[PDB]
From a paper:
To access this source of nutrients, gut bacteria encode α-l-fucosidases (fucosidases) which catalyze the hydrolysis of terminal α-l-fucosidic linkages. We identified and characterized a fucosidase from R. gnavus E1 with the capacity to recognize fucosylated glycans capped with sialic acid and to hydrolyze α1–3/4 fucosyl linkages in these substrates without the need to remove sialic acid. The enzymatic characterization of R. gnavus fucosidases focused on previously uncharacterized bacterial fucosidases revealed that fucosidase ATCC_03833 belongs to GH29-A while E1_10125 belongs to GH29-B subfamily. The enzyme consists of two distinct domains, a catalytic domain (PF001120) domain comprising residues 46–366 in N-terminal and a F5/8 Type C domain (PF00754) covering residues 385–526 in C-terminal.
To further investigate E1_10125 ligand specificity, the enzyme was crystallized in the presence of 2′FL, providing the crystal structure of the complex showing the β-fucose anomer bound in the active site. Electron density maps allowed modelling of residues 23–527. The catalytic machinery sits in a cleft in the center of the N-terminal domain. By proximity to the bound fucose residue and homology to other fucosidases, Asp221 was identified as the catalytic nucleophile and Glu273 as the acid/base (amino acid numbering based on recombinant protein sequence). Trp325 creates a CH–π interaction with the bound ligand and His61, Trp72, His114, His115 and Tyr162 provides additional hydrogen bonding interactions. Phe59 and Trp219 provide a hydrophobic pocket to accommodate the fucose C6 methyl group. The fucose binding site is conserved with the S. pneumoniae and B. longum GH29 fucosidases and is henceforth referred to as the − 1 subsite. In the E1_10125 crystal structure, adjacent to the proposed + 2 site is an open platform comprises primarily neutral and hydrophobic residues, which would accommodate Neu5Ac. This is in marked contrast to the S. pneumoniae and B. longum homologue structures where this region is partially occluded by incoming loops. The ability to accommodate the sialic acid moiety, as also confirmed by STD NMR, appears to be enabled by an open region adjacent to the + 2 site (Gal residue in Le antigens), which  comprises residues Met220, Phe259, Gly260, Ala261 and Thr265 with additional stabilizing interactions likely to be provided by Trp269 and Glu262.
Residue numbers in the entry: 23 to 527
Amino acid sequence: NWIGDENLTGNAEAPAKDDVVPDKNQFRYQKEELAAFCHFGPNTFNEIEWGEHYGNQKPSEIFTLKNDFDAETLVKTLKDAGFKKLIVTAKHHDGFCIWDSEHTEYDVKASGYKNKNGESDILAEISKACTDQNMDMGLYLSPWDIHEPSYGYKDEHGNPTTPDKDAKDYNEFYNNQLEEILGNPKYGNDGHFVEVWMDGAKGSGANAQEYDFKKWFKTIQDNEGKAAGYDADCMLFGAEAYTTVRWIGNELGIAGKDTWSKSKVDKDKNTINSNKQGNATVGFEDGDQWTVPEADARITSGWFWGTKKNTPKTMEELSDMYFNSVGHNATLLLNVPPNNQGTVDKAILDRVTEFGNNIKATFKTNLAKAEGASVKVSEVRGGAKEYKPGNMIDDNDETYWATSDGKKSGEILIDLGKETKFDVVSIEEAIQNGQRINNYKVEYRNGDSGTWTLLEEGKTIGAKRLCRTSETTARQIKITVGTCDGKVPMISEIGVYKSTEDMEK
Ligand SMILES: C[C@@H]1O[C@H](O)[C@@H](O)[C@H](O)[C@@H]1O
Ligand SMILES: [Ca+2]
Ligand SMILES: [Ca+2]
Ligand SMILES: [Mg+2]
Ligand SMILES: [Mg+2]
Ligand SMILES: [Mg+2]
Ligand SMILES: [Mg+2]
């Protein structure tokens, strides 16, 4: 007995929200799906991934950019391809700062680089382009610093000593740089960053250094969080118990099949457990802290551009990433590295554009909305307009279908209106109110009766589940979603699609 949108005159209160829900930044990020990384600095000019061997070489010797950095082209290409954020490596492990910093001489200002206006600040250049195009930004600022004298415990002359005798505190230097960037209107999207990357990767032989994470976080939020007047705190990557965007746990762009946007944290001990399973952090159904699962990956073989590492991944490789990250309730943070001329190689740009074009065309035509198609459900919450099945195909994340209290599971019938070719089924849970769905099943058949053929079954939906299969023909698709006793499922959007040739499995 399938229920449509007609004659729903009932009423009901909204389903209770989960205890653990995303803040406004986390929610926005999960719905954006696509973010870009930009690795650029001395490594770009020295055919290396970790700049461990620069020694006492001057900025002019290691950062040799002549041409005006082309921020415009990069940002425009990324925006056109559907990327909604750019995370910039302001400082990598080598310590070289690509903004004009008063707190070090190891920066772009000291290098000799100057744009058309004689200014020397790559971060400012990227920020201007992001602001012009309304591209949000993240800030990567390496905690491990190979160059900065204050890193580690040293006396006035540079001899190693105990923490109590340390003459210059690295925590103050790092904090000052956060304040310098975050506090200045010329950095960020109209002064704003939504994410700070403080990844803890560190050379096995590097000196000990304790980080004053609490001090750093306050500085971040005083400039970019609620304390600064924003609607959410700035998201933090690599911040232990204060993490709000977690590492997916590999660099392949692959999230586990059943990925939860929640971790277990202990703010007393400053620990975090995000449930490592195989090569991915799959999170916890009963996690106490929302963490956005962020799958970082390289479009080329390295993070930095180089003459041996400038071949972009194929559409097959990139489509695999997309379906296994975005399709598994994770974001995809794809690195697109500038070259030693300060632009991006044509082949790389073109692959980015191609990837974007393929995503757009794959999801252009929602077959559940075709003429003669219909979406119905096994039950509507209170028989009320507010939870009608049409809420799953209105391109509105704020509207959802749900069942009545006491019904923890429901079915969705998509009738395509005729025998129809497809290979992608898309399901989106209303995660603004929590991630709670713990079983799903997608089935199909020819005609309007007879046994169902299983496409895919699993646990989670979250921000987005994409079920990709080989080209299939069917008339009806049935989706089953359920949660635990005393809760009801909420689905904000569904769709059925045939992918482009270069996105097919
Ligand atoms: C995105 C990756 O973050 C890590 O901290 C670094 O060790 C890698 O070089 C790369 O920048
Ligand atoms: Ca020190
Ligand atoms: Ca909706
Ligand atoms: Mg969307
Ligand atoms: Mg420029
Ligand atoms: Mg300086
Ligand atoms: Mg700011």
